[PDB]
Amino acid sequence: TMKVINDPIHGHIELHPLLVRIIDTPQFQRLRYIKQLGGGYYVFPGASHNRFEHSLGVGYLAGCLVHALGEKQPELQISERDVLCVQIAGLCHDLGHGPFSHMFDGRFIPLARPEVKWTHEQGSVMMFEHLINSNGIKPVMEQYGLIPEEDICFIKEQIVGPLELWPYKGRPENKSFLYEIVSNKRNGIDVDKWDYFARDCHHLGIQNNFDYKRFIKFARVCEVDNELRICARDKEVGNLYDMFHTRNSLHRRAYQHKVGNIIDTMITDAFLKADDYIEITGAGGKKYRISTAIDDMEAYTKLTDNIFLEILYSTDPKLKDAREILKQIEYRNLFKYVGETQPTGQIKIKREDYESLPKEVASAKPKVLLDVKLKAEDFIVDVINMDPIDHVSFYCKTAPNRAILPEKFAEQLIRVYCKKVDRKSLYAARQYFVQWCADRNFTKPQD
Amino acid sequence: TMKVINDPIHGHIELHPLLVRIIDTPQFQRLRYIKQLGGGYYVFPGASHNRFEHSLGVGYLAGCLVHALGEKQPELQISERDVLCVQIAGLCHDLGHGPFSHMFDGRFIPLARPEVKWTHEQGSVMMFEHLINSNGIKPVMEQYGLIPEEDICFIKEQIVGPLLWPYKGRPENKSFLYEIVSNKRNGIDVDKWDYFARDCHHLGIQNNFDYKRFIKFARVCEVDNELRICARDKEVGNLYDMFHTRNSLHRRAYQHKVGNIIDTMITDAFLKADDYIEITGAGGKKYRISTAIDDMEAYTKLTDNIFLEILYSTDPKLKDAREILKQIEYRNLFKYVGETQPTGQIKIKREDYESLPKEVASAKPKVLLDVKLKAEDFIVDVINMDHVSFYCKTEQLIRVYCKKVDRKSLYAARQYFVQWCADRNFTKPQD
Ligand SMILES: [Ca+2]
Ligand SMILES: [Ca+2]
Ligand SMILES: [Fe+3]
Ligand SMILES: [Fe+3]
């Protein structure tokens, strides 16, 4: 029997028993305790949604798209085992997110361990493996028509990409269109984008002006340059524009919110000041750190937004520095905005250099003398990244099996904040920053 | 100042600087970590909203109504400090909710301390006093025209009621102000308007009520030598629309048969953890989950975090409680046995909640039982549940669950349950 789920975005969702068995695990239920938008909840009171609902919706949307392509085109040979593997992929694609979602792999892990290369997608693959073996899922997948060894590789591949000339090994090239459903690496348009476009709009108080149901209802696999890709109906071009406007409207208003991104760096700052003292017991009882729990998936299972409240409710004097940074958020005595810049015509800043940025800003010597000397610890440097226009294929009515004034386009933008709150300190921080942008060949900060 | 907030229910809302001063406190930020529907989040995924955003909405809706009545009818001489006071009340009316909202004051505290008489409105008043004294709110109240002696009393009175006109915060000629945040006659108020629309927005249930046009026709008329808030005779269709939303949210979400089982499961784990969980309060005094209500420095740090503290714990003393929470994650829950209702008789009071599982285990079914069940194995869940004044243009159900999961124990539990219903003269279960 299939469990039914009432989602405020998708209505009733029928979940396959194999999906239900995967959901009913502590590795999956930990997504209940990770905010979708991280620190954005502290600016948008309606954005209380977690990764749990979003993962349920992506699996539903992933199965909706793959099942629609099979019913319209039986020649593609999309099996029910294929539909299940895409559902599991969409359901488990975000298994590797840390506390407060992109706050963790985007900022904290680069700041805590700059030498390691870590993404939440690679954590999804590892946590997916931990979920399967700790809960005996392989016999259940086998029971529902899945060949686990081929299908586990297939599910991991559509989550993270090639695990190691056709580079995918879970499905042959004649089923390549299935790799565009959960996490489209080519144009970035997938059922993941659609879920949290509609989910964030519904929770933030922003309007969604595109119909993802229209996209799935009229999607068709057509041949584009000796390749089988997922093509859209020509009548959906206006729906596609509205999707990009919605994505743009979501970024400028919500994702790139100035206070919401300051609170992200404040939670990151407290996490860094607590990283030497918080204990997370993993495999065999070994105690891990917040930055090292990404190395053992048993410890990572217990690393959620709870770390925020464990620090906040702590009485240990060792966590006093981290605890009072978090109490600053409650009192709304936040870090102060200094300015903004962009590396126009320059190499984009890499994650491995994030930790060196506050020290470069402090060493930047302004020509004007200053009666307050600031150090690197007083500076916060926030690198806000984004991540296709002519990479969507369209099909007409006459040839359904053949391909036929836009939005503003931005890139990396760098913001600097100051932990000091006194007028004289904010002036120097601006001196350091405008100086920094100069010898760093970045755009002049707009006064 | 005057911070604007975009809420998905009410849109852009303006916050008075005094309200912002109150919200920006650890006593109010506490509400960010307490789910609105408690265990309903594990049945309805979309129901991730907490008491924080709901309180912001009630504070907004309370200010909208009092300001609407002041503009249309200046004869009520509603002052601006009357509006700020009604706003503060709706904003802080849910300050006293414990972990998982009605799960805490409804079931857990009665089961942990039956002698203790406690409600969440009672705690909202105590948390309100702790918020003021710990953040210097009284000088900010004076800066914006309030009289803290009588106004703070006015806030607490419209949250919990009166501690002959029994109110001291406002005279009788402003009696209609007490009907805005928490109503004793109808049950209608700006509090229910918010969580009717907010819960519907999060549960996937369609909302029929239009509170905005209700605030439009809202007028203060007279009933039986009393000033009350009155709706138009022609807006009766909107009331019928809401009363259905009220009933749908109850039938479908608040009394969900699995959502209420999980609520008792968390309460059961909280009880088995109460002897060891410690929460620092006044002067470093360690407190229990059931005793944090007695000191608001501890009750400030008592949120849904307790669920995760036990689940993540490694103390062997907490394994009994920690393993019950594991079963919620695995969906190996308690077993529904049946439902009954008191026959209009005496209601089952919170003081008796503890003796009820022993009563069911002490019943003697008239048929042989191949499995003997003890008082632990039973869970008894007591779920407690034309009057509107108009103007023209001038009671209990009891559910029993079983902790033992085998099909052969569920049969005996049904025989225990039916016998306990009969000898207590309840309604016969639906076989
Ligand atoms: Ca992702
Ligand atoms: Ca209430
Ligand atoms: Fe995602
Ligand atoms: Fe309320």
Alpha helices by DSSP H, listed for B204-256, are: 211-217, 236-249
What's this structure's resolution in Å?
Answer: 2.4
Which residues, in sequence order, are bridge partners of residue A382?
A415
Which residues, in sequence order, are bridge partners of residue B327?
none
> Cβ distance A86 to A19 under 8 Å?
no
How is chain A split among helix, strand and coil, in percent rounded to 5? Answer: 50, 10, 40
Q: How many CB atoms lie within 10 A of CB A164?
A: 4
| DSSP characters over B31-53 | GGGSBSSGGGGGT-TT---BHHH
Q: Does A8 contact B at CB distance below 8 Å?
A: yes
Do the chains contact at B329 and A24, CB–CB below 8 Å?
yes
For B228, phi and psi rounded to 5 degrees? -135, 170
Contacts of B233 (CB under 8 A, 6+ apart): B390, B391, B392
Q: Which value, to the nearest 10 degrees, does the dihedral of the CA atoms of residues A137, A140, A146, A147 take?
A: 60
Q: What angle do CA A186, A192, A195 make, to 5 degrees?
A: 140
Residue matched to tokens 């990479």:
A391
Q: Does B52 contact A at CB distance below 8 Å?
A: yes
Which residues, in sequence order, are bridge partners of residue A403?
A395
Query: Residue B77 and residue B71: Cα distance in Å, rounded?
Result: 10
Task: Report residue A145 as tokens.
Answer: 């028509």
User: Which of B68, B40, B385, B388 is closest to B240 using CA atoms?
Assistant: B388
User: Which of A98, A216, A85, A77 is closest to A157 using CA atoms?
Assistant: A85
Ligand 4 centroid to Cα of residue A89, in Å, is 39
Measured in angstroms, the CA of A366 and the nearest CA of chain B are apart by 33
Nearest to B48 among A6, A50, A281 (CB): A50
Chain B residues touching residue A24 (CB < 8 angstroms): 329-331
Which residues, in sequence order, are bridge partners of residue B286?
B280
> Cβ distance A375 to A358 under 8 Å?
no
Q: Does A46 contact B at CB distance below 8 Å?
A: yes
For B360, phi and psi rounded to 5 degrees? -65, -40
Task: Report residue A163 as tokens.
Answer: 């695990």
Query: Residue B84 and residue B89: Cα distance in Å, rounded?
Result: 9
How is chain B split among helix, strand and coil, in percent rounded to 5? Answer: 55, 10, 35
Nearest to B53 among A48, A313, A330 (CB): A48
Domain boundaries, chain B: 3-258, 265-330, 335-385+395-423
Q: Which value, to the nearest 10 degrees, does the dihedral of the CA atoms of residues B10, B12, B15, B20 take?
A: 90
Paired sense of beta strands A394-395 and A228-233, if any: parallel
Ligand 4 centroid to Cα of residue B38, in Å, is 13
Residues B3-258: name the CATH superfamily: Hypothetical protein af1432 (1.10.3210.10)
> Cβ distance A101 to A38 under 8 Å?
yes
Q: Does B394 contact A at CB distance below 8 Å?
A: no
Q: Which helix (H) or strand (E) holds B201?
A: helix B190-203
Q: Which helix (H) or strand (E) holds B167?
A: none
Query: Residue B366 and residue A96: Cα distance in Å, rounded?
Result: 55
User: Which of B312, B301, B304 is closest to B278 using CA atoms?
Assistant: B301
Give the residue on B whose Cα is nearest the Cα of A55: B45
User: Which of B216, B64, B93 is closest to B159 using CA atoms?
Assistant: B93
Give the residue on B whose Cα is nearest the Cα of A135: B330
Contacts of B173 (CB under 8 A, 6+ apart): B227
Task: Report residue A405 as tokens.
Answer: 């004034």
CATH, domain range A336-387+405-447: 3.30.70.2760
Q: Does B17 contact A at CB distance below 8 Å?
A: no
Query: Residue B292 and residue B301: Cα distance in Å, rounded?
Result: 9
Protein fold of B335-385+395-423: Alpha-Beta Plaits (3.30.70)
Q: Does B330 contact A at CB distance below 8 Å?
A: yes
CATH of A3-235, one of 1.10.3210.10, 3.40.50.150, 3.90.650.10, 1.10.260.40: 1.10.3210.10
Eight-class DSSP state of A6: E
Query: Residue B146 and residue B140: Cα distance in Å, rounded?
Result: 9
Report the side by side order of strands in the sheet with A220-223.
Answer: A220-223, A228-233, A394-395
Query: Residue A181 and residue A215: Cα distance in Å, rounded?
Result: 12
Nearest to A5 among B29, B45, B303 (CB): B45
Do the chains contact at A304 and B308, CB–CB below 8 Å?
yes
Query: Residue B25 and residue B23: Cα distance in Å, rounded?
Result: 6
Fill in the amino acid letter for B301.
Answer: K
Query: Residue B154 and residue B163: Cα distance in Å, rounded?
Result: 11
Three-class SS of residue A439? helix
Task: Report residue B243 as tokens.
Answer: 């009363």
Shortest-distance ligand to the CA of residue A62: 3
Residue B1 buriedness (CB in 10 A; 0-12 / 13-18 / 19+): exposed
Catalytic residue, from B10, B120, B130, B202: name it. Answer: B120
Spell out the SS3 assignment of B112-159.
HCCCCCCCHHHHHHHHHHHHHHHHCHHHHHHHCCCCHHHHHHHHHHHH
Query: Residue B37 and residue B199: Cα distance in Å, rounded?
Result: 8
> Cβ distance B154 to B169 under 8 Å?
yes
A202 noted as active-site residue: no
Q: Which of B24, B29, B258 has the most A C-beta neighbours within 10 Å, making it the best mutation to test the interface with A? A: B29
Q: Which helix (H) or strand (E) holds A178?
A: none
Fill in the amino acid letter for A426.
Answer: L
Q: How far is CA A300 from the centre of its chain?
A: 17
Query: Residue A66 and residue A16: Cα distance in Å, rounded?
Result: 15
Do the chains contact at B49 and A52, CB–CB below 8 Å?
no
Task: Report residue A100 as tokens.
Answer: 């407060």
Q: How far is CA A104 from the centre of its chain?
A: 10
| DSSP characters over A87-112 | HHHHHHTTTT--TTTHHIIIIIHHHH
Give the residue on A whose Cα is nearest the Cα of B203: A8
Eight-class DSSP state of A403: B
Q: Which of A5, A6, A14, A314 has the most B C-beta neighbours within 10 Å, making it the best mutation to test the interface with B? A: A6
Phi-psi region of A136 (alpha: psi -120 to 50; beta: other; left: phi over 0): left
Task: Report residue A155 as tokens.
Answer: 């599910």
